[PDB]
RNA sequence: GAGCAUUCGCGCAUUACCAUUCUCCAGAGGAUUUAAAUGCACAAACCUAUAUGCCUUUUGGCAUAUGAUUACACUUCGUUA
């Protein structure tokens, strides 16, 4: 509690101190999930959508870890 | 039958990002999302199924008359100052 708010800790620009981003929240995975499926539906496998999203996926992606319940 | 000649038309096809790890994982299951009538309801032509008045009720029951009789009117294409 006195880190978060008596000593003088978060007071440098944006740049300095940034984090990782939160992973995405589950709405948002919903909404990509139902953009893959109408992609591979109407477009095909072998489209360029479904195949940057594949390529996408596959790299490793760097992300915080949730605290709270939300 | 040439032509995206024309239409703020219709249907189909197509559009590529390159990291960098603090995301719980693996299965089981078939909901959600997307796609489209050969489904549903009708519509349009097409084919099939006597007159007066009473009651009608998406339609027939009742008297009369050309009437118990093998018989009878009509679709005429015209044009030559």
Do not use: M
């Not at 539906?41 to 360029?48: K, L, N, P």
């Amino acid at each position: 509690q006195l880190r978060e708010h008596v000593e003088p800790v978060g007071l440098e620009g944006y740049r300095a101190n940034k984090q990782p981003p939160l992973p995405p929240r589950k709405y948002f995975q919903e909404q990509s999930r139902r953009w893959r499926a109408k992609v591979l539906t109407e477009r095909g496998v072998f489209s360029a959508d479904a195949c940057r999203e594949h390529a996408e996926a596959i790299r490793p992606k760097s992300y915080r870890r949730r605290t709270g319940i939300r």
